[PDB]
Amino acid sequence: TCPFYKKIPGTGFTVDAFQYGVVEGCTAYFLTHFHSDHYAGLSKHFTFPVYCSEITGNLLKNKLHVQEQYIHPLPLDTECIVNGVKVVLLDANHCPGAVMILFYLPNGTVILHTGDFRADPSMERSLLADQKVHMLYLDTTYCSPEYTFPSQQEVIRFAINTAFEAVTLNPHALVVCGTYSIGKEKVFLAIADVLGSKVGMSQEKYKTLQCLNIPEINSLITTDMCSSLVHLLPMMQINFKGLQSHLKKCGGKYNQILAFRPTGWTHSNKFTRIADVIPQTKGNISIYGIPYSEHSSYLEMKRFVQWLKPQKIIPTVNVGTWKSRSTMEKYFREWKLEAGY
Numbered sequence: 001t002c003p004f005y006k007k008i009p010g011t012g013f014t015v016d017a018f019q020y021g022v023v024e025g026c027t028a029y030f031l032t033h034f035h036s037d038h039y040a041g042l043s044k045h046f047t048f049p050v051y052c053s054e055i056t057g058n059l060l061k062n063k064l065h066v067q068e069q070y071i072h073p074l075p076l077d078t079e080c081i082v083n084g085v086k087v088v089l090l091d092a093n094h095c096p097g098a099v100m101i102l103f104y105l106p107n108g109t110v111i112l113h114t115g116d117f118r119a120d121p122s123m124e125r126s127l128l129a130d131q132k133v134h135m136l137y138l139d140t141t142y143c144s145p146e147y148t149f150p151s152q153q154e155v156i157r158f159a160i161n162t163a164f165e166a167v168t169l170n171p172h173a174l175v176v177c178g179t180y181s182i183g184k185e186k187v188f189l190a191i192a193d194v195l196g197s198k199v200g201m202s203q204e205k206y207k208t209l210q211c212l213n214i215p216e217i218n219s220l221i222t223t224d225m226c227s228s229l230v231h232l233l234p235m236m237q238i239n240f241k242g243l244q245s246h247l248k249k250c251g252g253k254y255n256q257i258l259a260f261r262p263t264g265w266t267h268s269n270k271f272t273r274i275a276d277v278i279p280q281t282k283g284n285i286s287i288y289g290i291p292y293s294e295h296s297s298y299l300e301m302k303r304f305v306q307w308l309k310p311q312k313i314i315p316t317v318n319v320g321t322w323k324s325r326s327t328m329e330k331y332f333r334e335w336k337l338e339a340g341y
């Protein structure tokens with residue numbers, strides 16, 4: 001049955017709640033983004049109204065076959081009315097199409113649900129700056145001080161420089177990038193752009209990417225693997241066996257693989273700077289794990305909350321153990337005492 005932290009009090013709404021069958025009293029289902037742990041349950045047989053971004057709505061129609069009459073895409077940064085309640089969608093700085101949702105309840109309460117987000121100071125100048133928020137439903141994925149990671153910009157610099165060096169030393173090396181969901185597209189697109197190649201991929205992944213409004217996508221991606229020296233493969237195939245196999249399939253076009261696994265976090269971060277990262281190597285295959293995150297670090301999360309000063313925080317992640325919950329609640333109290341709210 002539906003957990004309380006997916007339910008918006010004083011409305012008929014739910015958020016990211018499609019795996020519970022018909023939720024009692026739900027008149028509209030919102031979807032923050034197209035990741036399977038959040039859309040799980042949607043299909044062509046869903047007949048309740050779904051509210052979401054334009055990009056998310058493209059993906060629902062084309063990938064899951066949800067019928068068009070039930071998809072209600074909303075523009076960003078725009079006050080809209082849903083079943084008599086004012087809502088706004090804000091950019092979540094997560095994956096393409098991912099939003100945060102502001103709800104303005106009829107009794108004066110204002111609620112922000114972050115969905116999945118990577119907090120950024122740019123958010124301190126959206127429609128959030130303009131009123132008080134009473135309740136924050138917060139993506140607490142990395143809510144512990146050990147989770148530090150570099151900016152996305154520093155991680156993409158490292159990846160472009162590494163790949164450009166490798167292919168310039170050996171014009172017969174192939175670059176491979178792992179993927180399993182939308183998100184982290186900058187990794188493979190920035191590498192392709194520095195090498196003057198398109199990114200080659202399966203027809204299914206190409207279709208997914210064409211749903212995203214990314215300018216000049218026909219320009220950067222392709223299904224013709226032969227013509228490309230940057231290949232996208234499932235994340236599961238990013239190991240020595242999977243990559244030796246792929247290299248066999250390229251018919252002696254290539255004699256080395258440099259592969260990237262963009263992970264969220266790995267405990268290498270506590271002891272290492274980005275500059276100091278090294279691959280795992282076997283034979284003519286090297287694998288780099290790079291800390292490209294689409295969730296807030298601990299310090300990013302803390303800053304956002306100390307700026308917003310909500311009255312009540314409801315975590316949405318790590319809520320299944322008493323130790324995790326207690327840890328998070330202790331950090332929330334620290335933040336509030338330090339900031340004076």
Ligand code: NI
Pocket residue numbers: 033035094116
């Ligand atoms: Ni997500």
